[PDB]
Amino acid sequence: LQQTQAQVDEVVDIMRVNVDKVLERDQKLSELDDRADALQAGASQFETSAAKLKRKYW
């Protein structure tokens, strides 16, 4: 029972290592949104700029 207690408390700490991960998870989930949202307009407007460009130089 106590052998298992020690083993399981090691595994409490493996979950605490997952807690050490989860801030590194969530902040990166944030900043990848913080790029994708800003990427969306620069991606969007370039076809419109292309239309503005190619009407002239045929």
């Binding site: 409490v12 969306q40 991606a43 370039f46 292309a50 190619k54």
Partner: protein, 51 residues
């Protein structure tokens, strides 16, 4: 059982957290190819604006 309940709290936190993150992955699924659907489609006309 209490110790396993403590890790169980951290794990229902873990799994429902990465669950909730899966919606930001859904907005990736938007902004992964709709981003391509603008960009590659625009360069299909700028590369052909030389024509």
């Amino acid at each position: 059982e209490n110790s396993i309940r403590e890790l169980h709290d951290m794990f229902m936190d873990m799994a429902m957290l990465v669950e909730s993150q899966g919606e930001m992955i859904d907005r990736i699924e938007y902004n992964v190819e709709h981003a391509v659907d603008y960009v590659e489609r625009a360069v299909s006309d700028t590369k052909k604006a030389v024509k």
